[PDB]
Design a protein around this ligand. Structure first.
Ligand code: MG
Ligand code: MG
Ligand code: MG
Ligand code: MG
Ligand code: MG
Ligand code: MG
Ligand code: MG
Ligand code: MG
Ligand code: MG
Ligand code: MG
Ligand code: MG
Ligand code: MG
Ligand code: MG
Lengths: 53, 124, 225, 223, 63, 128
RNA sequence: GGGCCCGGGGGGCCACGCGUCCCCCGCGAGCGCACGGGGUCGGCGGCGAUGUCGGCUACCCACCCGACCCGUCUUGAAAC
RNA sequence: GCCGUCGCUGGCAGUCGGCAGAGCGAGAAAGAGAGUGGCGCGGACGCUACGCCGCGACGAGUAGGAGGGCCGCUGCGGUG
């Protein structure tokens, strides 16, 4: 989990531009489907409009 | 890793079918369509796929190369085999045993190849 | 080089066979010895009585050391003191059976449960048939049929009980490890008496079934085993 | 190698010999009988020669297969089963057939075939029952017996002799009495028939059919 | 009928973590194997404490 | 002449009648769908002899023949040719059922493909 | 009677190598049958395209046994 | 015999294959240990580990509690 390879940047014509970017560390962060579902669950309620009779 | 990626998709995947008390997987390179850690065709570094040829003649054996694990375009090597039935199975057996490339999928790959070739015979 | 390992593999198998063969001889000869012992016990009692009758006296045989106990009543409406004593005998079901070695402590427990049990003194044949047809060991708290001798040996071997004959000799003669060999046996699940009963609700001496019927338990054991 | 010797331990009861281990040890003289420690065929061809695999790998494999059974013992095939015969059925005994077109007829028991089925004859001229196989469970063995100890039954009269041959249809196909059977019937009948006529009123008894009538109860009457 | 009570037959104890955390469950897969296939009681104790709840896993201070 | 399954064990059903709800023969408002009677005096709930029976886990079917069709197969609803191909490697234990709302046009292709793959179809002769 | 059923002068033994010291006086081979870790036959027969075969359940009918109407309060409800 | 529940907080990552060697159920702790001196190219299934497998016992239930529903209804984010 400490491997940060080089990522190719591609040109608008779909070819490698020759430039490289080290993989940012955030792509090695823990993948927590249960945290995401908790956050997606509770944030998606924040754009709701109220209803009532 | 494969194990970590199986915890994400074992019950949440676009390729997952749950129906009639059964579970299947529709992703490519799954030899038995089975929702399983062994037969999943996406999470392992090395996978084997057997599919019919673009024309209804022969099979295509797909093997995942070692290097481009994050490069889907060059990740898979396709090989078309259009020999007689017994010769086709021998090549698949050798491509797996001799290379030691998932030897646990040897008979599943051989059984899927025999099912594709049989489906390519004339319908009676 | 594999050939040298194969010989080592084979010589280990041969040793196990040779140990296994020597153990079969041990149990074969223990049974031969018990047969002699049982005969002397049977013949000795007859000889003691004959020599007392010769002298005009009375030979009074030793009070039995062993009792077999059968619960003859159901589980509905059992009083608390009887309910506890029947649980200590391990007779939690009707027509369950156990051996109980007799002494002041135990004979007075059997008196509390008198209406709920038929008991008496089993002979050698009763101990044989009970343990062969319906003998199950308590091994890792499970009820395992004693289909093989290793089942007995692994559990009671430390007491030198390694075969069904050693188990039958420990029970029948009430040996030093009767407690262990007898707790090892699961309570016997006996069938309904074939041919009926007289009256389960009264004592045997009243023409019923409850209580101590002495050696007459063996007739009951024949019809339920 | 040495020629096999008949077992030196006679059977006392099934599974128990007459002699103990040491007794057999001596009888066998084991005190002196001590002992101490292709897949291919080459063929020439018109390369020069090819190595040929005698058995080839399967050209097909089903999607699923069943596992192997566990191993059992004592489950023999039919041909290896022991055949039993009621003690009341001895050769020359008169039997009453209970099933088939020949039901109720009284026939003469000749021998028990290797399959265990009985061989019987009417004889044909008395009740039109030929040399025919019958199952013992479906016959009543009467107590009447003629002495056919001197009768030579042809040896080719075996289970394979009496096994039915299949007939095909596309109208109908009819069974035909092969001339050999007629010859065999006469050969056997010519020896039994004179012995039946030796007993008075026996040939008429064999012509007559068995039936239950009013007040007649099988458990009460002797056959 | 058998004279027995059934109120205590079912044992109340965790056989797994209530947590859906996939990294915790990968460690449980690991120590389920070690506890099973080794005679080490230490593995059994750790496997048991991986099932335990938040309040049964108090934090350990540095001091 | 139909495709046969890998095995055809005898199917043993403990019960073949349905569990009809209590008093559902007496009213139309009471449907036969099972409802557990819960009245205090309810004699069906008390398991009195000669009364309507109640379902309990004892009637459960043998796990080896559960959900098994009389033919020996197990069904699996399919809506298109692509869903059908999941049964390629289990064609000896699982058959195909085409969903009711698949047009007559598409049923021809699903039935045609299933024959090629040796998959059995429960309803191949429908919407002709 | 007990003492591996002590010591001396027809019938079964889960005795059967030996150099000994002396109490006492570590792998043979095969072959086969089986009351042996749960059933097999390497056994058979009849019938079949317009009237017959199979179809638990379901539709109708009959019969034998069983069977009081639910919900509710209630110690107690089929309850007059 | 079958179903489920509970218990064994039981077993299975060893599918370790021609870079091969198939075993660890058995009365009785701990190594199928390592060494140093004296022709064929072949070998079923498995493992959604939230899975799969084995063994034993058990199964009444109002009030009431708890679990599991690939039970059912409407709508929302994703996916098919
Ligand atoms: Mg009472
Ligand atoms: Mg009787
Ligand atoms: Mg009373
Ligand atoms: Mg019960
Ligand atoms: Mg209860
Ligand atoms: Mg409780
Ligand atoms: Mg009430
Ligand atoms: Mg009536
Ligand atoms: Mg009320
Ligand atoms: Mg009142
Ligand atoms: Mg009421
Ligand atoms: Mg009234
Ligand atoms: Mg209950």
């Amino acid at each position: 989990a400490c491997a940060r390879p080089l990522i190719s940047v591609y040109s608008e014509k779909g070819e490698s531009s020759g430039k490289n970017v080290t993989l940012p560390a955030v792509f090695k962060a823990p993948i927590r489907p249960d945290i995401v579902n908790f956050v997606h669950t509770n944030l998606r309620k924040n754009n709701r409009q109220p209803y009532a009779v | 890793s494969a194990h970590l990626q199986w915890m994400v998709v074992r019950n949440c995947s676009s390729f997952l079918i749950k129906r009639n008390k059964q579970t299947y997987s529709t992703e490519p390179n799954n030899l038995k369509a089975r929702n399983s850690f062994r037969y999943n065709g996406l999470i392992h570094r090395k996978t084997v796929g057997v599919e019919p040829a673009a024309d209804g003649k022969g099979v295509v054996v797909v093997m995942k190369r070692r290097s481009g694990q994050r490069k889907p375009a060059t990740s898979y090597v396709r090989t078309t085999i259009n020999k007689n039935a017994r010769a086709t199975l021998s090549s698949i057996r050798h491509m797996i045993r001799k290379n030691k490339y998932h030897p646990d999928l040897r008979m599943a790959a051989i059984r899927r190849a025999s099912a594709i070739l049989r489906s390519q015979k004339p319908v009676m | 080089n594999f050939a040298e390992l194969k010989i080592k593999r084979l010589r280990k198998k041969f040793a196990q066979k040779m140990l296994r063969k020597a153990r079969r001889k041990l149990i074969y000869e223990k049974a031969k010895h018990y047969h002699k012992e049982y005969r002397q016990m049977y013949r000795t009692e007859i000889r003691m009585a004959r020599m007392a009758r010769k002298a005009g006296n009375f030979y009074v045989p030793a009070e039995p050391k062993l009792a077999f106990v059968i619960r003859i009543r159901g589980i509905n409406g059992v009083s608390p003191k009887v309910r506890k004593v029947l649980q200590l005998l391990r007779l939690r079901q009707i027509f369950n059976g156990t051996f109980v070695k007799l002494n002041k402590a135990s004979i007075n427990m059997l008196r509390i449960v008198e209406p709920y049990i038929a008991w008496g003194y089993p002979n050698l044949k009763s101990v044989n048939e009970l343990i062969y047809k319906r003998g199950y060991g308590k091994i890792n708290k499970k009820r395992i049929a004693l289909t093989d001798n290793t089942l007995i040996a692994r559990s009671l071997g430390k007491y030198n009980i390694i075969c069904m004959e050693d188990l039958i000799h420990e029970i029948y003669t009430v040996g030093k490890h009767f407690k262990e060999a007898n707790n090892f046996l699961w309570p016997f699940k006996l069938s309904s008496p074939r041919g009926g009963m007289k009256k389960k609700t009264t004592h045997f001496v009243e023409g019923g079934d409850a209580g101590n019927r002495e050696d007459q338990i063996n007739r009951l054991i024949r019809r339920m085993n | 190698k040495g020629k096999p010797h008949c077992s030196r331990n006679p059977v006392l009861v099934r599974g128990i010999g007459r002699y103990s281990r040491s007794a057999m040890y001596s009888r066998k003289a084991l005190y002196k009988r001590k002992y101490a420690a292709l897949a291919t065929v080459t063929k020439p061809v018109g390369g020069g020669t090819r190595v040929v695999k005698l058995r080839k790998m399967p050209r097909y494999y089903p999607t699923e297969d069943v596992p192997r059974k566990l191993l059992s013992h004592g489950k023999k095939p039919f041909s290896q089963h022991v055949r039993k015969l009621r003690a009341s059925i001895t050769p020359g005994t008169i039997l009453i057939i209970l099933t088939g077109r020949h039901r109720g007829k009284r026939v003469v028991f000749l021998k028990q075939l290797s399959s265990g089925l009985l061989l019987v004859t009417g004889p044909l001229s008395l009740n039109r029952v030929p040399l025919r196989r019958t199952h013992q469970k479906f016959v009543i063995a009467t107590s009447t017996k003629i002495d056919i100890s001197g009768v030579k039954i042809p040896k080719h009269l075996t289970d394979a002799y009496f096994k039915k041959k299949k007939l095909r249809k596309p109208e109908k196909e009819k069974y035909e009495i092969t001339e050999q059977r007629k010859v065999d019937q006469k050969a056997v009948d010519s020896q039994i028939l004179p012995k039946i006529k030796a007993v008075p009123q026996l040939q008429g008894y064999l012509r007559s059919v068995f039936a239950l009538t009013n007040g007649v109860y099988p458990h009460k009457l002797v056959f | 009928g058998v004279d027995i009570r059934h109120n205590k037959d079912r044992k109340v104890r965790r056989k797994e973590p209530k947590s859906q955390d996939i990294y915790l469950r990968l460690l449980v897969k690991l120590y389920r194997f070690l506890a099973r296939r080794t005679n080490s009681t230490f593995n059994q104790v750790v496997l048991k404490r991986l099932f335990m709840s938040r309040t049964n896993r108090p934090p350990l201070s540095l001091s | 002449a139909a495709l046969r399954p890998l095995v055809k064990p005898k199917i043993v059903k403990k019960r073949t009648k349905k569990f009809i709800r209590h008093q559902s023969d007496r009213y139309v408002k009471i449907k036969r769908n099972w409802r557990k009677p819960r009245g205090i005096d309810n004699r069906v709930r008390r398991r009195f002899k000669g009364q309507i029976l109640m379902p309990n886990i004892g009637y459960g079917s043998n796990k080896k023949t559960k959900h098994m069709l009389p033919s020996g197969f197990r069904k699996f609803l399919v809506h298109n040719v692509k869903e059908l191909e999941v049964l390629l490697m289990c064609n000896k234990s699982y058959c195909a059922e085409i969903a009711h709302n698949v047009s007559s046009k598409n049923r021809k292709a699903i039935v045609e493909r299933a024959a090629q793959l040796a998959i059995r179809v429960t309803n191949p002769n429908a919407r002709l």
